[PDB]
Chain A
Amino acid sequence: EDLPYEEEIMRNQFSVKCWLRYIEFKQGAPKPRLNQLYERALKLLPCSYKLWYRYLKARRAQVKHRCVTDPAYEDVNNCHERAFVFMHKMPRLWLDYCQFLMDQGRVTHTRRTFDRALRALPITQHSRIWPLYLRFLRSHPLPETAVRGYRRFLKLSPESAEEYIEYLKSSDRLDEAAQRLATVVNDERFVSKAGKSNYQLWHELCDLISQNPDKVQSLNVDAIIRGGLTRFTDQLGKLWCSLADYYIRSGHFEKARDVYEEAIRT
């Protein structure tokens, strides 16, 4: 049926339905046919983006024995053929190729492609690149804080901000944990802290956990013990935390008697 398929496409090249039917009819597709349909649809009309992405995914599923060397380049080339098509299929295929193929070297190219799709900025792609960046930083936490800053400085999101704060608190002692702690205890508005919790004490708890033994620059006692002394409103909670902070912050040769006098006053 190859000859009548070509006899239809000679007069109906602009019809892609005949091309899809011809690709379905031959159940041996990618011997000549994947490249032929790609060439015909890429020289005929700048359309059929969904069918082209589906065919690229089907070929990737078919040629995945040698997982991705040539199929990855083919999917990337078809994805670059999308000029300004900010769809929910080409970024998905780019992320799939960055997951299967080489990553974190070419994932910079995938991030650049996501930014190029996000130049017109509809909020669908960054909400998929930032979780993809956090999942890709599961072996090396170098760009995790950077994606967190690109999402927190370009999107107001309390749940994402709390996730990034737990991400930077998953560091050694105070590696960006102090910055997220200060940004979470700042509390200019009242929507970000109320995202996944409402107690008006989690910020004091985080300030006290920052007052814990860590390796921050100084962050010694000033703001944390200051706020815990003025607006405590919790019996023996801020007092004990302040006594321990003056107990072991750095040596505490004079801060120990500071905690003792604080206990003698209150």
Chain B
Amino acid sequence: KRVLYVGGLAEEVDDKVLHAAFIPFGDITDIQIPLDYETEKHRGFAFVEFELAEDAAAAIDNMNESELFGRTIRVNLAK
């Protein structure tokens, strides 16, 4: 319950932006972003694994329906 899925990411949203935007809730363990090798861009979604499940739950509470790159994203438990 430390890994959460975050979708609706603007094309400019990157791993550094995700680390900066999720770091406030607690240390992050990993960031995985599916990309399409033919285009070199992401598919609009990613998975962030935070160190703490409580920090992931707080980040889910505070980030779901939030604004990032001008657009609303989705945050939830990944599995």
Interface residues of A (CB under 8 A from B): 49-50, 85-88, 120, 122-125, 127
Contacts and interface: CB of A to CB of B under 8 A. Distances in A.
Q: Is the interface of B mostly helix, strand, loop or mixed?
A: helix
A88 B55 contact: yes
B23 A86 contact: yes
Interface stretch (B7-15, B24-32, B35-43): B24-32
Contacts of B20: 86, 120, 122
Contacts of A122: 20-24
Interface size class of B (residues with CB under 8 A): 10 to 19
A87 B22 contact: no
B55 to A, nearest CB: 7
Contact of B27 (A87, A124, A127): A87
B64 interface: no
A98 B51 CA distance: 28
A8 to B, nearest CB: 25
Contacts of B58: 88
What are the 8 A-B residue pairs with the smallest beta carbon separation, nearest first? A124-B24, A122-B24, A120-B20, A122-B21, A86-B23, A86-B24, A88-B26, A88-B25
A127 B58 CA distance: 13
A137 B60 CA distance: 30
Nearest to B66: A123
